[PDB]
Design a protein around this ligand. Structure first.
Ligand SMILES: N[C@@H](CCC(=O)N[C@@H](CS)C(=O)NCC(=O)O)C(=O)O
Ligand SMILES: N[C@@H](CCC(=O)N[C@@H](CS)C(=O)NCC(=O)O)C(=O)O
Lengths: 205, 205
């Protein structure tokens, strides 16, 4: 069986859990709880993923896969249902780019979170935090203007990644209030939030 | 033709340039110079990649691909030579994980660089910088202990990414002196550095 380094707050981990849920592969995966930060290492995790990040997936043979996008690609090839990542065609690079946009939202939102929650407030850099927040808002603007129809057509790699990014914004950055300027995205997000895979993977209250 | 948002210092960009060089696709690509930082946006770049990061690749039809790993996957499917990313088999996820390890080295080394070069020294956080440096050293240790033979067997996605990560360490973090503790990696790195694709893509003096 597989072992996934796991935390119920992480949206990168959540992408993997949603994909396992959608593809019916949860029964293959043991979760290994992990609490960590860049300034608070998890030594057991570090022995499997030297970068000290989750998710990391340990295979039946002991080999370890990371990061999330590599794990997602692996798991999508493990089941015989319709692939959640297009194998070829323009759809492949379109959906993978949308997923990368979602990852970029998570990257920025995690950097802001670490800064505001772990770094001494006297050492905060406001132009930095604002720079990160700007990436998030530019990204959301694009999804709203260019991606609504594509996201709706299939709950795949792109939809899962965006959905998880949005959930993390609600969870750790509710001050952004992303729904105001992005109604179509918000409406879609409420709808997919009702999927069993999303309900089952919400971050802790 | 294609348009690549480009800077000769960026190792993520360098991965794309090395792959184009190796696969003979340089004649398809116009470079669009970009200078940027998280606190100094490039407005032309932002219109193509909302995350405000390079590389970003604009296709013949106007569509934009990012980030680097998506661009690398696209370009590797564009030529008819031997693929630099394994299409299946255990080799696919092994080589993609090694590439992700290299990306993790770049991620940490770029975060440190921004902190030390752009953030007011009174606001530096030493436990943070040290946390990032630790990921780099743990990653290098792993390449040295587990990956030498694999990297040597093919100058592919994994080798290109690692090679570019190491070049950036020499360029922006020469104080790490990674060669001391990692002789086999160092010897391999000197050898592949002599490839025309590497010579042609070195960061500026
Ligand atoms: N590129 C990685 C990013 C994963 C990531 O940053 N995970 C966070 C948890 S949400 C983490 O492990 N933080 C620990 C650290 O950065 O040291 C991926 O896609 O999996
Ligand atoms: N995940 C991205 C990371 C690219 C990246 O961070 N590029 C740096 C240049 S080396 C950058 O664009 N910095 C501008 C910024 O972070 O705002 C990729 O793999 O392409």
């Amino acid at each position: 069986s597989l072992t996934l380094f796991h935390n119920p707050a992480s949206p990168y981990v959540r992408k993997v859990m949603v994909l396992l849920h959608e593809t019916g592969q949860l029964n293959r995966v043991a979760l290994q709880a992990s609490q960590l930060s860049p300034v608070a290492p998890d030594a057991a995790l570090n022995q499997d993923n030297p970068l000290g990040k989750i998710p990391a997936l340990r295979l039946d043979n002991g080999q370890v896969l990371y990061d999330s996008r590599v794990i997602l690609d692996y798991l999508d090839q493990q089941h015989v249902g319709n692939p959640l990542i297009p194998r070829d065609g323009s759809a492949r690079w379109r959906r993978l780019t949308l997923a990368a946009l979602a990852d970029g939202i998570m990257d920025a939102s995690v950097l802001v979170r670490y800064e505001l929650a772990l770094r001494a407030p006297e050492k905060h850099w406001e132009q930095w935090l604002d720079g990160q927040r700007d990436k998030i808002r530019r990204a959301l603007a694009v999804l709203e203007a260019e991606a609504i129809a594509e996201l709706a057509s299939h709950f795949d790699i792109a939809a899962i990644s965006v959905a998880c990014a949005l959930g993390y914004l609600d969870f750790r950055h509710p001050d952004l209030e992303w729904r105001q300027d992005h109604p179509q995205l918000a409406a879609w997000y409420f709808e997919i939030s009702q999927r069993p895979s999303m309900l089952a993977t919400r971050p802790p209250v």
